[PDB]
Amino acid sequence: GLIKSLAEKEKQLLERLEAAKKEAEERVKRAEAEAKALLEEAEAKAKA
């Protein structure tokens, strides 16, 4: 006599999991972006 417990709890724990995956990706990216920018410096030196 109250489906709001299991219904509306699933849709917050599942949404909290997605936000975990986002800042998992949107941070692991940053490391790959940092890498690009490093190997640019790795030329700026070589040409210098």
Binding site: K9, A31, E32, A35, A46
Partner: protein, 61 residues
């Protein structure tokens, strides 16, 4: 109480992921640094050759 268990179980996987996803963000930085070193160590060496040749030529000349 149970449920607060289920919520103490998620905030746990969602550090496992965030631990896995910042133990690659180094691996990317390691292999990128171990790249750049080697991408400039061969270059260092190349200039010697291109200079060892150029000065010898200029000795003979």
């Amino acid at each position: 109480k149970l449920e607060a268990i289920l919520s103490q179980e998620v905030e746990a996987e969602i550090q496992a992921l965030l631990q896995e996803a910042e133990a690659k963000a180094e691996a990317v930085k390691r292999e990128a640094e171990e790249k750049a070193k080697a991408l400039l160590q061969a270059r260092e060496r190349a200039l010697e050759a291109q200079y060892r040749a150029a000065l010898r030529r200029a000795e003979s000349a």
